[PDB]
Design a protein around this ligand. Structure first.
Ligand SMILES: O=C(O)c1cc(O)ccc1O
Ligand SMILES: O=C(O)c1cc(O)ccc1O
Ligand SMILES: O=C(O)c1cc(O)ccc1O
Ligand SMILES: O=C(O)c1cc(O)ccc1O
Ligand SMILES: [Fe+2]
Ligand SMILES: [Fe+2]
Ligand SMILES: [Fe+2]
Ligand SMILES: [Fe+2]
Lengths: 363, 363, 363, 363
């Protein structure tokens, strides 16, 4: 089938003074013709400006740690968060066209003051403890393996209750929101509104009992009311899938590939309107079938060792390393040991708007 | 406002030979005129043929136990289940116009053979253990406080793995299904297809991790894929609600009234298309506000002591006792000690069809 | 596969004084055992008490006309409507277990006073004119071929603006509503609230422009806000389908079988929560493939000549004749001339509750 | 309340060699810190790079006409479409961050060859006739006042059947699709696949009968199957609203302001997943209340004379003139004569993702 390089170009006008005058009037009148731009504007398949890229956790940690020494956290700058900037996205602090990802660092006894914004956000922890994030006044402990949510427009601030630093990753729909013009922002309290440090938040104490819904929470929500998806449950779910597979029972998405989607328990859908969160566990030796998927995804290695292949290029990966797969880039994971990864993506956007497509090798 | 007793009856024809001949032709031609039937067919508010009624657990147990002595369980009759028959429903084995409820009794080492039917069903246990119910080949342990589901068209049979008898209650949409003509039925295996007795079923091992969904289970279901809602989770959820109330935090539906709805985790909706299951826990001294609700509900006392008021009549209640509240009958619960009750209803039917109405005293 | 007649009956207790005493205690305690009732309560496939039956329009007209002479219309009896009573439904004025159908007759200058009720209702006209039905104060002309709606809880009354009588058919969910206990009813004005007789109602003037929705009507409704589905549109739609078929283009449901569903334009779904309305037009010679469908349906012949086959029995049909197909009864239509039929059913109930099943001969 | 200009900037590190070295390592490692970017990335309310702007139809026509003389239409460039480029969007052929708008010109007997692409598209006509657009093989006449749809992935080409030129406007989600990486594109036939010029398309002959749905079209669609929303219906709907207002009846969105939304008749929702189309008619003298709305909108004056106010600035408008209102820009319309406008927007994106907000003056 023809592409933009092989098709006949039948709209090539004669290069005369009249043509050049027409084209000068276009500039003056804020007009740009489709016929000179077609192939750029409307590619055969997606061709992102973002490139696949890997950031090493050892490098992220060094830069975050040095930032903890040299930059105080507080009002204005709001957070000591270091955004991952895709080399292909022109100097914008965007890991992909839709998503922001950052390593955030909070030192001994620091607080990061309360604010809210339309942009949706989550926190994920490969390692560490000591921080509580207070979401609409509800303190939520942050620990290794936990997904924490802060849906758009919820007040949130954080405090380190400890004499030891903690780091984690943030994901937000900042780049989508900046480009599409949906951002609103409000400064809240200079200190978190509750310094208490309970083991479990009020949201969890209501919503984290499997298959049960409070009669006071019968209205569905656009975002999950669960503030913490704790490691204990994620680990148990993934283990049970591999055990069910051992027993000859359906459960894994693919052979030796256990995986869950974190969900809004009021609907069974995605945690937030713009962001999908998953967790994958591959047995030693597993090699996933190559996928092309519309929209972008980011993974963080939680545990074990393995590799990612993107555009045919293998990169070895270790605990904490992060990678981005832009739209339609062919990708696969290869597990050396048992290989655990946290994943996020802009797939709820693509699916809501009927733009999603998937190609899987061998099917 | 006028009712059918106080309105003028302006369609009263002269009682002549011609009128009586007209009315005889109506009988011959299978015609029945609205004008002689209006008030019956279309009441001012619902007036059920079912009456409020209470069955004592001590009486249910005696009859079930004697049935265990005198009647063998097996093919044909299928189950040793004793249906609660509303005195107002003309000899039909219906607790309400929509619902069947029964005490079922399975003796030492008995099996009840496998079958399936379009009618949706659940099991609830106030006391006992030893039985496994095998649902589409997945053995599901039955224990005190557990809700077990068997959605329409799932093969199910049960076996007592023990030398001791067990009793439980069944709820089904049998009366709805019989009157509306939606019943299909298929005999399966004469013995259960798996005699293994695991602590937890495969359904639970996949689906009972709070806020997590397997990537192999991304299609929504019409009924919950959770085969067991275990007492441990229900008890914890209800306790946390009362604790949150202690802490000044929203959670209970009403003061001292904790309550959950069992839900399909794929949608956040009801367990099955025709049947809603809830569990309520009232602090000692709680008296619920009087409700009128369209459609019928049945409760079983799980624990504690208290009373129900129906149509203004108080009946004292004990562990295991069962009562039915027909459509639009005013009802309230009064808790003497801490008072725990399992509840089921036909409310998903009423709500699906936009017939639901609720009146709550003092609001 | 086994049925209830061929299965072994393994729950047959020894007929002793102790057994008979047990069974007497069951009666005293309002208990009815499943084992003596199983096959009745839970049939292999639906076996309705309703039977297929045909009512002749010439007979309906004679009885309605005589009723117009002998019975005045007004308060109390409310409407001069003659309900079609299924011979199998025990003297209940029910055409099926879910639906009421009636021929209603309004003589010269009569009014039928305003009321409302939870039961949903529609009017269909095989022939006649002169009546306006005033629905929540909006006068809606009634003419040949028109479907008129009156969703539950809308005030409605009717008046004949003419010196000539008119007859039509009513359909309601009266039998569903009576058996399920969802009926509420309120008397309104003794006269219609607006005697004006516009050609088109306000509802239609807002809602009957194809593919357009008023910005003041962006909230979805549970029932259609279109008060009249006029013959002109139904006829044009059916004709265009047969023309598209002539042109080799997809459109008809089956060869020579044009058909539409009347829909709620806010959702694209059924006109009312409990009732589905369709209109079918078959070319001369068309014989539809035999269907078994869960739930009941009623047709009225609008025009042309043909036959229905039910349970293998052929009945010839003429203009106005009405027939009922109970749940799971095999049925087919045979067209002698071009054959037009209006159809209603309880299918939205069956589909909402996941009870629908369909068997089509040759597929 | 604080904004980014008035808040204290508490994250200002000491400008030392160590800090500058840290910041150099950030560049080297593709890291950009939040603390230097916060206010840009996360504004108090949306602050688009797009600016309000007006393009005159007389200018668009001159440039399109000259393009018809100097540039041939055909393969490669695909369409002689002149995109409206927002002065604030850096040289991108985008009228807003989400939407493309263009004047397209097709001369006597020209054809524009068939292609398809994931990007959704529509055509609107302020004036002219003679072109047919062939959509998945179904020829759709284009005439004054018509909205034509071409949902993503439908093959489409166009041909002028006449010796006279025609111009119209195109709207697409090109800028959304380019930035979010969802574009796929396929070249089809070099000539349209059907040169026939029927008055009405097959889609319309099936789908444009108010409140009726073909039994062969019971599956819902993500986009409307109506290929043409003809002027006749839009005009009648708007007139009826103003008449109902005359009669004291609810209908208009605001006093003297009639308006419709073009809808997908299978769902009652928007025509396509990314684009909302409306048509407004204001009585002489009407001044709409000032709105701020999230996301962008574009209007074209269809008929009459009036003005738009954006950011407090009044611009007088005539037949065919086009304007863009970027996200959150305050806007109002003022009608001198009776004032008719076609409107499109990215609102289905904002609403699907829960980003929509609206401020209306005086409420
Ligand atoms: O609230 C946060 O911690 C936050 C973290 C980020 O990386 C970017 C924006 C934010 O608002
Ligand atoms: O499958 C059962 O245990 C069952 C129990 C009942 O009480 C009634 C019908 C049934 O099919
Ligand atoms: O309102 C009516 O015309 C009506 C007609 C019927 O056949 C039965 C009940 C009703 O309320
Ligand atoms: O198909 C079209 O006519 C078209 C028109 C545009 O203005 C831009 C892209 C397109 O594909
Ligand atoms: Fe934040
Ligand atoms: Fe059963
Ligand atoms: Fe009525
Ligand atoms: Fe195109």
């Amino acid at each position: 089938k023809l592409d933009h390089e092989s098709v006949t170009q039948a709209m090539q006008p004669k290069d005369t003074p009249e043509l050049r005058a027409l084209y000068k009037s276009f500039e003056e009148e804020s007009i740009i013709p489709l016929w000179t731009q077609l192939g750029d504007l409307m590619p055969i398949h997606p061709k992102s400006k973002a490139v696949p890229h890997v950031w090493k956790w050892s490098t992220l940690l060094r830069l975050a740690r040095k930032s903890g020494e040299l930059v105080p956290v507080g009002r204005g700058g709001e957070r000591r968060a270091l955004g991952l900037a895709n080399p292909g996205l022109g100097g914008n602090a965007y890991i992909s066209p839709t998503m922001w990802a950052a390593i955030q660092y909070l030192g001994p006894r620091e607080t990061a003051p309360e604010h809210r914004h339309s942009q949706n956000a989550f926190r994920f922890v490969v390692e560490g403890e000591g921080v509580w994030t207070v979401v609409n006044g509800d303190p939520v402990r942050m620990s290794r393996g936990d997904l924490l949510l802060t849906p758009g427009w919820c007040f949130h601030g954080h405090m380190n209750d400890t004499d030891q630093p903690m780091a984690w990753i943030d994901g937000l729909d900042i780049p989508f929101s900046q480009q599409m013009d949906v951002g609103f922002f409000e400064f809240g309290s200079d200190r978190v509104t509750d310094y208490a440090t309970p083991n479990f938040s009020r949201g969890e104490r209501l919503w984290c009992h499997p298959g049960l819904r409070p009669l006071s929470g019968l209205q569905n929500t656009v975002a999950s009311p669960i503030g913490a998806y704790r490691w204990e449950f994620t680990d148990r779910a993934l283990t049970e899938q591999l055990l069910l597979e051992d027993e000859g029972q359906p459960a894994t998405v693919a052979p030796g590939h256990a995986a869950i989607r974190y969900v809004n328990p009021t609907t069974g859908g995605d945690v937030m309107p713009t962001l999908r969160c998953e967790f994958h566990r591959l047995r030693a030796g597993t090699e996933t079938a190559t996928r092309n998927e519309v929209g972008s995804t980011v993974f963080q290695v939680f545990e074990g060792a393995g590799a990612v292949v993107m555009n045919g290029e293998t990169t070895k990966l270790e605990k904490g390393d992060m990678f981005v797969v832009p739209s339609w880039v062919p990708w696969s994971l290869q597990a050396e040991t048992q290989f655990d990864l946290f994943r996020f993506s802009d797939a709820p956007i693509m699916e809501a708007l009927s733009f999603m497509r998937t190609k899987i090798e061998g099917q």
